[PDB]
Every structure is written in structure tokens, then in C-alpha cells.
Design a protein around this ligand. Structure first.
Ligand SMILES: O=[N+]([O-])c1ccc(O[C@@H]2O[C@H](CO)[C@@H](O)[C@H](O)[C@H]2O)cc1
Ligand SMILES: OC[C@H]1O[C@H](F)[C@H](O)[C@@H](O)[C@@H]1O
Length: 394
């Protein structure tokens, strides 16, 4: 269903759909606020569902699931010359731990989406975005500020969920649609046991193949250096159809945020040069147009932006408020954004392709393929170049 040797992925994530992210759907979190005090807002889907309780959470999520992405989005994704979607889903869609506050029902909509993908000749990765106990302590794992994925029975539960995913989506029924199953989104390498993570990846790989599935196995790079995974899951060991998913941003530290636009572009180009040297098929499965961390709650509920010196003892670089609405952007920022998007596109198409994060947000333009396209900052068609050949790939 996909030729990873001869095809380039041009895709978007369907983020914020099956795993709530405050910065992507702030309207679901804002009502908990008391005036300007944010201390009472649930920081993640875990706490959101827990505070709401099952009945309300299910009501509110059913409205969200049935409206946030529909078949019209898939048609538009297709119309825009995109050929791919990555679909994040949390473990809780498939299995609840004892005492999990999460509500279920995502599977219904995942399967609707696979059909919509099929109707529109769009291919899919199914991405396990959140693991029990959390693999990274990010709010987008479902559970912020803890990472107990490798503690207790959390790894085993994760593998059990993957086996469920493998059986339902790794087999013949979806062989024309699903061109990858991603074992685990963004395990936070630096705080995990990497030997245990490798064993987990290998267990996932073996289990999938053991079902008779030939679906590509997608492993996130765990924030390791380029080439780190070169010697893992290799053809030499009879391990095949493996893709490395690299994520790329330049906004999550003061140092990165301080780069001028030329330096930002140089970094993006070098992502390409480095990816090219790797020995697995690889795709930039998340990246965006963001040159700031200004989107409300991007760093989490009740956390400010490093860009304006309002988070993690970071110092002021610039004001975020003028950057919140794309209609108020300076000509310089619009130009910087288009250059940055084009440089990243070139870099990522230099290997397996790219998957923008994300298709849509309520009101965070840096993070919305739709919004950037509508404002002429994301090339349309995606091959368009206002700033051709910023990288000089050979
Ligand atoms: O050194 N590393 O391994 C590392 C450093 C910074 C990282 O940045 C994280 O990226 C996530 C995804 O965009 C954000 O949700 C999160 O807020 C941010 O802290 C993630 C990983
Ligand atoms: O932080 C922006 C974006 O970064 C990564 F792509 C995460 O996997 C997403 O969940 C998140 O929304």
C-alpha cells in the first residue's frame, strides 16, 4: 500500500482528536478557569475526565469526536495534495487500568476515519500516543508530569494494547490503508531505561509480525541522536519493514527560541542532511511552523511561554500576544514562517517525507495546517517554493 523507497509522505496529524491537548482545544479546558486563575484547570485528559466524571466526560467527548474530524476533513486533506494521516490514540481507547477516569468510544471514530482514508486514497499510521503510567510526562500522553511507563505492569499493558491494535489494524482488513503502526509516541529517552525501551520495541515488532502482519513497524526515535537506531531492528537480523519517526521543533528551549531565522533554517536543513545518512526509512512524523512557544498552553495548562520569559525561568525574547492571531503578524513573521516551512519540507522530502502537527487547532495558527494554508504561509500546492533551495540538497 506504500513504497517507502519510491514514495514521499505528505501528511498531517489528526492531533487533539482522540487525545485531548489543552493548547489544541483550549475551549474544553477554559471553562474550569476562575477568572485569571488557572490553578483549577485539569492539566491533561486524565484529570479532565476525572474531574468531569464518566457521564459528562463521555457526553463532551462524543460531541468532540463526532465533529473535530469528519469525512470532509479527509476530502480536504486529499484536495490539498496530501496523501497521508497519522492518527494518535491513547492506550485507554482499548484498555483501562483499574481506576482510570478515561472514557472510551474512540475506536468507533478511528474506524470511521480508516474508511474515510480509504475513500480518499489516504494512507495511515496508527500511533499509540499515550501509554499507561505515561512514557514522557507530557500532557499529550494523557498524563502530565509522571513517567511510569517502565514501572509496574505498565510496559506489559502497553504491549497488550499493541497486540489488540495489531490484530484489529495490522491485518488484511486494512492492508490497503494502514501503512504503519507506531509502537509508542515520544518515549522520553533521557529519563527511561533505553535497554528496556529497546526490548519493548523488539517485543512489539516480534508480536506484530507473529500475527502474520506485514505492516511497517514505526518506532519513534525517543529523542536520540540521528543514526542511533541504525543498528536496531535491522535487515541483517531479519527484521524488516521498519521506519524511524523523527520529530523536529525549534521552540522547546530558550536556546532554540533565540535563533535568528537564518539559523532556524540552517538547523532545518541539517535535519535533512542527517536523516539522509540513516539506514532505516525515516519520516518526520511531527513538526510545525512554530518559531515560538507562544500558543496558549503549548507547554501545558498553567504554564507560560519561554518566548516572553514566562516559563521555566527562561528569559524574555519577544511578546507572544501580538503573535497569537495570524492576522496581526508582522510581514517579517509571515516571511520567516514561509521560509521555515519550505526549508523543513525540502529537508523532510529528502528522505521519507513529513507529517505536519497538526491538521487543525481551535486558534493556534503555528500549529494548524489549515490556518497556515488559508493564510498563504504553507505552500499550496505543497511543492510551491517562494524561497527555493534554501538547503542545497544533492
Ligand atoms: O531532551 N529531550 O529528550 C527532550 C527535550 C525537550 C522536549 O520538549 C517537549 O516536546 C513535547 C512535544 O512537542 C512538548 O509537548 C513538551 O511540552 C516539550 O517539553 C522533549 C524531549
Ligand atoms: O508539542 C507539540 C506536539 O509535539 C509532538 F508532536 C507531540 O507528540 C504532540 O502531541 C504535540 O502536540
Amino acid at each position: 500500500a506504500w513504497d517507502y523507497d519510491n514514495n514521499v509522505i505528505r501528511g498531517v496529524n489528526l492531533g487533539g482528536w482522540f487525545v485531548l491537548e489543552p493548547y489544541m482545544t483550549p475551549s474544553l479546558f477554559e471553562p474550569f478557569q476562575n477568572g485569571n486563575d488557572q490553578s483549577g484547570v485539569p492539566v491533561d485528559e486524565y484529570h479532565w475526565t476525572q474531574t468531569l466524571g464518566k457521564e459528562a466526560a463521555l457526553r463532551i467527548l462524543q460531541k468532540h469526536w463526532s465533529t473535530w474530524i469528519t469525512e470532509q476533513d479527509f476530502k480536504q486533506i486529499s484536495n490539498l495534495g496530501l496523501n497521508f494521516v497519522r492518527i494518535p490514540i491513547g492506550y485507554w481507547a482499548f484498555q483501562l487500568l483499574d481506576n482510570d477516569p478515561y472514557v472510551q468510544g474512540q475506536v468507533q471514530y478511528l474506524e470511521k476515519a480508516l474508511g474515510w482514508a480509504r475513500k480518499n486514497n489516504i494512507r495511515v499510521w496508527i500511533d499509540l500516543h499515550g501509554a499507561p503510567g505515561s512514557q514522557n510526562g507530557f500532557d499529550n500522553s494523557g498524563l502530565r508530569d509522571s513517567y511510569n511507563f517502565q514501572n509496574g505492569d505498565n510496559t506489559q499493558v502497553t504491549l497488550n494494547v499493541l497486540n489488540t491494535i495489531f490484530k484489529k489494524y495490522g491485518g488484511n482488513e486494512y492492508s490497503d490503508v494502514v501503512i504503519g503502526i507506531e509502537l509508542l509516541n515520544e518515549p522520553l529517552g533521557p529519563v527511561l531505561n533505553m535497554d528496556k525501551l529497546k526490548q519493548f520495541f523488539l517485543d512489539g515488532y516480534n508480536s506484530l509480525r507473529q500475527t502474520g502482519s506485514v505492516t511497517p513497524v514505526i518506532i519513534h526515535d525517543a529523542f536520540q541522536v540521528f543514526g542511533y537506531w541504525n543498528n536496531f531492528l535491522t535487515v541483517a537480523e531479519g527484521q524488516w519493514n521498519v521506519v524511524v519517526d523523527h520529530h523536529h521543533y525549534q521552540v522547546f528551549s530558550g536556546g532554540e527560541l533565540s535563533r535568528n531565522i537564518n539559523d532556524h533554517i540552517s538547523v532545518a536543513c541539517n535535519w535533512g542532511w542527517d536523516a539522509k545518512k540513516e539506514s532505516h526509512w525515516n519520516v518526520a512524523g511531527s513538526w510545525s511552523a512554530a518559531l515560538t512557544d507562544c500558543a496558549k498552553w503549548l507547554n501545558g495548562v498553567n504554564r507560560g511561554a519561554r518566548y516572553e520569559g514566562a516559563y521555566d525561568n527562561a528569559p524574555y525574547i519577544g511578546s507572544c500576544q501580538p503573535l497569537l492571531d495570524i492576522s496581526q503578524w508582522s510581514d517579517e513573521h509571515k516571511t520567516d514562517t514561509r521560509r521555515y516551512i519550505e526549508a523543513q519540507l525540502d529537508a523532510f522530502e529528502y528522505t521519507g517525507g513529513w507529517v505536519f502537527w497538526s491538521w487543525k487547532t481551535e486558534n493556534a495558527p503555528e500549529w494548524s495546517f489549515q490556518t497556515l494554508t488559508y493564510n498563504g504561509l504553507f505552500p499550496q500546492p505543497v511543492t510551491d517554493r517562494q524561497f527555493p533551495n534554501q538547503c542545497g540538497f544533492h
